[PDB]
């Protein structure tokens, strides 16, 4: 790297370079229009080419940070539009780049991106593919200034793939709409995960992160020796620590350094990394992060020997407590790919707590002899919740499963906004659809990754406008206790029924023409208000009010005249429902 631009241009290729530069500027100049970004990208790209042709050509030896910051400072409208950020340009480069980092705005007032009609989108794509995808790349990037740029590039390539398939085909919308909802979903979850993982780093600390990573890595690479795992985790901590501070280039080099080290030590790590390690720089680290679990060594010993039975458990423990507990976690985790990480950390903390107690006592050995018994209830709690909830999901499917979740949660925390209860019960229900399709042995993992994001979403909303000390309690709990605290929420005995409000339970003919989704949401919103108003209501009384509403809606949308029915029979539902509750 006599010239860092030329080297990156050569490593990326022109198309990836141009996209990544568009995303990087999009995340810093969130208010400047597309055409101004197209102009920055073309200028940085002309410049890069000059350096590829001649590494000694003028300005080519400058740092990428330097070049990025100088282009920002050439934006003539910078002060008028972004203000404080323009004062970063008066700084000398080390402190300058630090100043730009603080002056991104997480979440700007930008209007929601409306999904155009399938036919408008498909024609847009066909006429000018590059500006269709790029404009929307710009639009996403500016709305998510913290999303890892190469992952956003990963999503774009999948969108593009979706249009290329679905737009020359028989029924475009029935192909394209399912692809786009899943991309939408998966993109929203990716953004929330990145956010979560940096918040968790700050809240819960470096130790907690290392434990998490030791557990996840040991499941992934069970053939790796513990020293290799601790080496990966120590470099991962650095990397994630740097990525959370937010400097794209430094994050990308750190991730590239890890991926390079991992790829150069495959045989010492995992037999599943061949295909990731053959990919170009840009995708390597992404592929490695997603790689499948290696198969565990076939005849591994019991953990009682090193952690229960040997003399010097206490000696080994006292000498390096975190190293010992790390080893316990490594050995437990590599044996249990079927466990959630968080369950593996519960188990580790149960072992820590017992060592702490037992190594003091005169006979530690008798004291901690039954620690493995303490793991039993810990393992079975999540396994049964998952049993019960998938069995329920199978009987009364996704939509009806949602309505079950919606009654449950509304009674536990009636103080929570109706939209919030609907959305999180909708989301929980989707995690049902997905994870109950896995066999038991794969389910707890599936549960964890998605529930982690549903629960953090839940807590951030609730921190913005609190409402329940109990939701606040669980939201502030240790990361291992979050979900069990929510699971220990009982029906709220304090709560005073919300008062009657007839508009809430008035429905018009508008509902039989609404989309499937919109009719479902409208019905769920009424369900919650019903429960809020009648939280004393038993199972059978709700089902009787629900089957009646369902018969009422078919009556009024099968009829020769609808609007009279959606008002006549609405009196003959609401009045009977109150009396029966």
Ligand X SMILES: CCCCCCCCCCCCCCCC(=O)O
Ligand Y SMILES: COc1ccc2c(c1)c(CC(=O)O)c(C)n2C(=O)c1ccc(Cl)cc1
**Which residues sit at the interface with ligand Y, rule CB under 6 A?**
197, 220, 236, 239-240, 243, 255, 258-259, 262, 285, 288-289
Residue number with CB closer to ligand Y (144 or 534): 144
In the complex, minimum distance from the CB of residue 134 to ligand X, in angstroms, rounded to a whole number: 8
Name which of 197, 218, 215, 229 is nearest 343 in CA terms: 215
In the complex, minimum distance from the CB of residue 219 to ligand Y, in angstroms, rounded to a whole number: 10
Q: 300 is in the binding site of which of ligand Y, ligand X, none (Cβ under 5 to 8 A by kind)?
A: none
Q: 154 is in the binding site of which of ligand X, ligand Y, none (Cβ under 5 to 8 A by kind)?
A: none
In the complex, minimum distance from the CB of residue 502 to ligand X, in angstroms, rounded to a whole number: 9
In the complex, minimum distance from the CB of residue 298 to ligand X, in angstroms, rounded to a whole number: 25
What is the helix (H) or strand (E) element at residue 362, kind and residue range? none
In the complex, minimum distance from the CB of residue 244 to ligand X, in angstroms, rounded to a whole number: 14
Residue 98 annotated as part of some ligand binding site: no
Residue 1 annotated as part of some ligand binding site: yes
Q: What is the CA radius of gyration of the chain?
A: 28
Structure tokens that stand for 351 in this block: 């072992």
Residue number with CB closer to ligand Y (243 or 546): 243
Name which of 377, 389, 461, 381 is nearest 429 in CA terms: 389
Residue 245 annotated as part of some ligand binding site: yes
Residue 242 annotated as part of some ligand binding site: yes
Q: What is the DSSP string of 220-279?
A: H-TTS-HHHHHHHHHHHHHHHHHHHHT-HHHHHHHHHHHHHHHHHTSTTT-TT-HHHHTS
Residue number with CB closer to ligand Y (12 or 537): 12
Q: Please, which residues have CB within 8 angstroms of residue 502's CB and are 6 or more apart in sequence?
A: 574
Question: What is the rounded (10 degree) CA torsion for 216, 221, 224, 225?
Answer: 20
d(CA 136, CA 162): 14
In the complex, minimum distance from the CB of residue 299 to ligand X, in angstroms, rounded to a whole number: 25
Give the Cα-Cα-Cα angle 514, 517, 520 (nearest 5 degrees). Answer: 90
Q: 573 is in the binding site of which of ligand X, ligand Y, none (Cβ under 5 to 8 A by kind)?
A: ligand X
d(CA 316, CA 319): 5
In the complex, minimum distance from the CB of residue 352 to ligand X, in angstroms, rounded to a whole number: 5
Residue number with CB closer to ligand Y (134 or 255): 255
Q: What is the DSSP string of 296-349?
A: PPTTPPPSHIIIIISTTHHHHHHH-HHHHHHHHHHHHHHH-TTS-HHHHHHHHH
Q: Which residue's structure tokens are 């390597």?
A: 284
d(CA 485, CA 473): 8
Q: 240 is in the binding site of which of ligand X, ligand Y, none (Cβ under 5 to 8 A by kind)?
A: ligand Y
Residue 522 annotated as part of some ligand binding site: no
In the complex, minimum distance from the CB of residue 304 to ligand X, in angstroms, rounded to a whole number: 19
Residue 185 annotated as part of some ligand binding site: no
Residue number with CB closer to ligand Y (232 or 390): 232
Residue 463 annotated as part of some ligand binding site: no
In the complex, minimum distance from the CB of residue 335 to ligand X, in angstroms, rounded to a whole number: 16
Residue 65 annotated as part of some ligand binding site: yes
Structure tokens that stand for 72 in this block: 């920002």
Residue number with CB closer to ligand Y (264 or 391): 264
Q: 343 is in the binding site of which of ligand Y, ligand X, none (Cβ under 5 to 8 A by kind)?
A: ligand X
Residue 430 annotated as part of some ligand binding site: no
Residue number with CB closer to ligand Y (145 or 414): 145
In the complex, minimum distance from the CB of residue 141 to ligand Y, in angstroms, rounded to a whole number: 19
Residue number with CB closer to ligand X (72 or 362): 72
d(CA 282, CA 28): 21
Residue number with CB closer to ligand Y (254 or 569): 254
| DSSP at 293 | P
Give the Cα-Cα-Cα angle 43, 48, 52 (nearest 5 degrees). Answer: 150
Q: For ligand X, which residue has the nearest CB?
A: 326
Q: 220 is in the binding site of which of ligand X, ligand Y, none (Cβ under 5 to 8 A by kind)?
A: ligand Y
Residue pair 294/272 in contact by the 8 Å Cβ criterion: yes
Q: For ligand Y, which residue has the nearest CB?
A: 197
Buried b (16+ CB within 10 A) or exposed e, 393-412: beeeeeeebbbbbbbebbbb
Residue number with CB closer to ligand X (294 or 448): 448
Residue pair 542/407 in contact by the 8 Å Cβ criterion: yes
Q: 197 is in the binding site of which of ligand Y, ligand X, none (Cβ under 5 to 8 A by kind)?
A: ligand Y
Q: 550 is in the binding site of which of ligand Y, ligand X, none (Cβ under 5 to 8 A by kind)?
A: ligand X
Residue number with CB closer to ligand X (66 or 81): 66
Residue 11 annotated as part of some ligand binding site: yes
In the complex, minimum distance from the CB of residue 409 to ligand X, in angstroms, rounded to a whole number: 4
Structure tokens that stand for 346 in this block: 């519960």
What is the helix (H) or strand (E) element at residue 402, kind and residue range? helix 398-412
| Positive or negative torsion for Cα 531, 535, 538, 539 | positive
Structure tokens that stand for 542 in this block: 């709700």
Q: 556 is in the binding site of which of ligand Y, ligand X, none (Cβ under 5 to 8 A by kind)?
A: none
Buried b (16+ CB within 10 A) or exposed e, 441-475: eebbbbbbebbbbbbbbbbebbeeeeebebbeebb
Q: 236 is in the binding site of which of ligand X, ligand Y, none (Cβ under 5 to 8 A by kind)?
A: ligand Y
Q: 369 is in the binding site of which of ligand X, ligand Y, none (Cβ under 5 to 8 A by kind)?
A: none
Annotated binding site for Zn(2+): 65, 245, 247
Annotated binding site for (4Z,15Z)-bilirubin IXalpha: 238
Annotated binding site for Ca(2+): 4, 11, 242, 247, 250, 253, 257
Annotated binding site: 1, 4, 11, 65, 238, 242, 245, 247, 250, 253, 257
Annotated binding site for Cu cation: 1
């Amino acid at each position: 790297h006599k010239s860092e631009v030329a080297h990156r241009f050569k490593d990326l290729g022109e198309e990836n370079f141009k996209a990544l530069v568009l995303i990087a500027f999009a995340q810093y100049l969130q208010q400047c229009p597309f055409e101004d970004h197209v102009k920055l990208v073309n200028e940085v790209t002309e410049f890069a080419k000059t350096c590829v042709a001649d590494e000694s050509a003028e300005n080519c030896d400058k740092s990428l940070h330097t070049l990025f910051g100088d282009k920002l400072c050439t934006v003539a409208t910078l002060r008028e539009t972004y203000g404080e950020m323009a004062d970063c340009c008066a700084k000398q480069e080390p402190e300058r780049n630090e100043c730009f980092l603080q002056h991104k705005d997480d979440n700007p007032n930008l209007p929601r991106l409306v999904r155009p009609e399938v036919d408008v989108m498909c024609t847009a794509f066909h006429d000018n593919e590059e500006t269709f995808l790029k404009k929307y790349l710009y639009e996403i990037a500016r709305r998510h200034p913290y999303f890892y740029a190469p992952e956003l590039l990963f999503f774009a390539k999948r969108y593009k793939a979706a249009f290329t398939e679905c737009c020359q085909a028989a029924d475009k919308a029935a192909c394209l709409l399912p692809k786009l909802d899943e991309l939408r979903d998966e993109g929203k979850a990716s953004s929330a995960k990145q956010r979560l993982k940096c918040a968790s780093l700050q809240k819960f600390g470096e130790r907690a992160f290392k434990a998490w990573a030791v557990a996840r890595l040991s499941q992934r690479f069970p053939k790796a020796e513990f020293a290799e795992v601790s080496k990966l985790v120590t470099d991962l901590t650095k990397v994630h620590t740097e990525c959370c501070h937010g400097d794209l280039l430094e994050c990308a080099d750190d991730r590239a350094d890890l991926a390079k080290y991992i790829c150069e030590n495959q045989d010492s790590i995992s037999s599943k990394l061949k295909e990731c390690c053959e990919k170009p720089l840009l995708e390597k680290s992404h592929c490695i992060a997603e790689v499948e679990n290696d198969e565990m060594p076939a005849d591994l010993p019991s953990l009682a020997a090193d952690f229960v039975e040997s003399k010097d458990v206490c000696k080994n423990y006292a000498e390096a407590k975190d190293v010992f507990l790390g080893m316990f976690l490594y050995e437990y985790a590599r044996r249990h790919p079927d466990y959630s990480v968080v369950l593996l950390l519960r188990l580790a903390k149960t072992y820590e707590t017992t060592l702490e107690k037992c190594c003091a006592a005169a006979d530690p050995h008798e004291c901690y002899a039954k620690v493995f018994d303490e793991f039993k209830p810990l393992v079975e709690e999540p396994q049964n919740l998952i049993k019960q909830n998938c069995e329920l999901f199978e009987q009364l499917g996704e939509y009806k499963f949602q309505n079950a979740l919606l009654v449950r949660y509304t009674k536990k925390v009636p103080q929570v906004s109706t939209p919030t209860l609907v959305e999180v019960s909708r989301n929980l229900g989707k995690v049902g659809s997905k994870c109950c399709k896995h066999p038991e042995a794969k389910r707890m993992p599936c549960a964890e990754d998605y529930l982690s994001v549903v629960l953090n979403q839940l807590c951030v909303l609730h921190e913005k406008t609190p409402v329940s000390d109990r939701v606040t309690k669980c939201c502030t709990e240790s990361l291992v206790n979050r979900r069990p605290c929510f699971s220990a929420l009982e029906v709220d005995e304090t709560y005073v029924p919300k008062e009657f409000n007839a508009e809430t339970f008035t429905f018009h003919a508008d509902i039989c023409t609404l989309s499937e989704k919109e009719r479902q949401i409208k019905k769920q919103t009424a369900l919650v208000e019903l429960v809020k108003h009648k939280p004393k209501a038993t199972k059978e009384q709700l089902k009787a009010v629900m089957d009646d509403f369902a018969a009422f809606v078919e009556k009024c949308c099968k009829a020769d005249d609808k609007e009279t029915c959606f008002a006549e029979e609405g009196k003959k539902l609401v009045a009977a429902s109150q009396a029966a509750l």
